[model samples]
Target: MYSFPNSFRFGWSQAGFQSEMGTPGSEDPNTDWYKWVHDPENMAAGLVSGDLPENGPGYWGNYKTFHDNAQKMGLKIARLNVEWSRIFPNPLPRPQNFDESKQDVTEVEINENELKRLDEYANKDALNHYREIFKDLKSRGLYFILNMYHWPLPLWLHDPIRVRRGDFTGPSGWLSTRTVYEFARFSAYIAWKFDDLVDEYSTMNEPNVVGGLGYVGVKSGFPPGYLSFELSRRAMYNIIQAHARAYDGIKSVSKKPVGIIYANSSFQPLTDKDMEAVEMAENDNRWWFFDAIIRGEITREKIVRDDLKGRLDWIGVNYYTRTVVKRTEKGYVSLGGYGHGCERNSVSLAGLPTSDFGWEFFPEGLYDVLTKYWNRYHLYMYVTENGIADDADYQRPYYLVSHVYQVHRAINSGADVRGYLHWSLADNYEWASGFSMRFGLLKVDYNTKRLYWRPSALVYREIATNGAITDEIEHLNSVPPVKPLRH
Candidate 1:
């Protein structure tokens, strides 16, 4: 059994691009994702494309209803990211050009039409809309945890010139110092705007995966194809700078604390001879981001030869599985990494159970990840994003129970875990994988546009209300009768 600290919080996270069904012309235009989905050739399984369909369960239109449900579950916090593209559709070309005095008298004056145009993209309306959501959450006695960036870049800023010349991937698309400055300014603005509503802030979500996949990793379709080492270094450096500026921005504006979320997958070497390989994998895979923010200095000599440091008030960990590294004649490789891919090695989950997505069901890995990071940094920690991806089966409630129990075990073992937030409250448009993976506690029938409560919702309600898993949940280790499966 596990005991939660008095400071521990519980909530769910949502993203603008994923949940807030875009309002036609009411908000800024969609970026590559919107365009990519329309091209039938790019979509998987001929899934009806073109971003989320119109008349979708537009969260903006239904936030009040959602918050009411969350309140009934005794949720204590809610997490959401403010999209950059939504805020600065046409970010100023140069940082110096942001000055209002340099413009003509007429241009300097704020007109209603111009105000509406700017508000459409500047996040003023979006933030206000979010503030209403936050206010509703607060009325239900829930705190707010806001994230600055969640992997979606503004369409206007997605130009090649803004990014490093060779690295055309999304990271390069955001290399502009102007982009960083605007993001910081916007971060400060939002923090001050919601000073009363939010208790915590996360500057950026999953920089490691974002940088590695978008910059260094060689995959077609994604920008900045496998290029020279310098390009990847520059991309990583820019992300660090962006996080620092945004953190500083929020700190300057409000008394609330800020942190960053890192998606960490533990790496285990196969043999004694691969100790260097283990060191390389561990440092390159995890330490780069943690060291930059926690130690406030770039300690990895080989990765980037630059000074990158930013202190964090807390560390948001998103852990799912572990990677087994083995020395091969074919050289180093990662197995079971995110994204649709084949297992590089002879991977096995036979000893462990599997989720609907076939991901190894290892609750102990959750405990290991929490304890490892706690012993190292000892920062107030929150499991920012931790949920199974299983849509074919409606066993998510079991997954939740297992994971939460593991978290409880970790806390009892001295891990300074302060809170737990489920991946989502409702099914939203997932990126890359699209809507194929379902991680939401509340099931949404995309075809019917109907939202149905899943067993997981009741499981979380029970956990939240009583601060303990029910006896029924404890016996979830034994597989229950399978329900009708759907793709």
Candidate 2:
């Protein structure tokens, strides 16, 4: 059995768009992701999974019961996202003397006068609903950690279909600096509005995921599924700038902690000849975001934006699996189907067992991620989102126990991790793959919209309530793989 610190929190994390549907008038249709998934052209081309998010779990209407489940799991805290599109369905009117140029957007600041303008523009109903949700969590003795953005853009800020066709004139998502200032305004407004309800805040969730899938990689089918290296780099830079501005705006209004959740992975080389590809994957997946936000260096040697440095008060590392990369004739690529391939025969060359989603079971990667980030950033950290997509309930218990054990190991080795939030409270939409992959402790039956506790949920409860992994619980799961195939 392994015990965590007394003050350490154990909880679950969820995104708004993924868990807030499956009820009448519950789906948020104003976001770009809503339009992206519903597009006929994308679906016909098989770029998207064609599964509608409107058919997911109904957290918007049934959040209280979800909280009861968290309370049942003996959680100390819960992380929830504030849907920007829901609160502000339309564009904010331009503040006085706003500059539209890409070069001057970094200078755009949201002062009290502009914050009042944002307050006038926000939807009162949506704001009140989120307030009630926070209150419910508090009443159930759970701390609320608010995430300001989680992968969906307001439709007014982006139009996916038009941009996918090579048109960039109107509301061209993160590729433009205008988005940075718009996000700043929204962040300041939310800070002022929800200041009393939240204990902590996160400006963005997985900026790397958005940039990689939307602009760099063509296979994930995220909105504006384009494949341009330049666009991807530019989009990522703009996202870093957005985080900086948002952090400043939130600090202006509230004293709460603010951070960003990064999707981290342990990138390894398939062989000595593949070191270059491993470097590229690591740079893009992990270090680049840290370099820009924490060090103010966009590249390795240049510290161009000193204002961007020290923007985060903490770091949220969302880990799942690792990828082994190789350099090919075309370019750098994953040796197989990256971390996971849905095909029946898809197996890990590392010889690790695979999850239902085909992701390799690499609990050690979690320890590597925590220690690596703590060594470099020296900031408080949290395992913000970590869970597996196991539908049959066979591997999930072992996955939870093993990963949490890794978290305990990191603490013993001196990573200042303060919490561990499992990826979800219940199974919901799994993005482009849709509901095909299950990553929830509470299984959701879509037909009745009911939540059933999985066996893993009980495993998590025992660990969380005792703040330790008991011997019996540890014995129920097999030992993790010793060493990965290094080639």
Best by the TM-score measure: 2
Cα TM-score per model = 0.82, 0.94
Worst 10 residues of 1 by lDDT: 101-110
**Model 2: per-residue Cα lDDT over 1-487, one tens digit each:** 7989999999999999999988887878998899999999989988889899999998988999999999999999888889999988988765566666644344556678878877887899999989988899999888778888998999999998888888888788898777888888788899898899889999999988899899867788898887888888888888888999999999999999999998888777778888789778777678878887887777525556778878889999899988778897877877675465423223466556677677877788789889988888899998999998877677778889988999999999999999999988899898888887889999999888899999999999999899999988986445434244121
Candidate 1 regions with alpha-carbon error over 4 angstroms = 22-28, 39-56, 97-123, 160-172, 217-230, 269-279, 299-310, 328-332, 336-351, 356-358, 392-394, 477-487
- List residue ranges in candidate 2 displaced over 4 A: 271-280, 299-301, 326-333, 341-346, 476-487
**Clashing pairs in model 2?**
none
Alpha-carbon lDDT, every model: 0.64, 0.84
Evaluate model 1: give its TM-score.
0.82
Which model scores highest in lDDT?
2
Per-residue error for 360 in candidate 1, Å, reads 2.1
TM-score of 2: 0.94
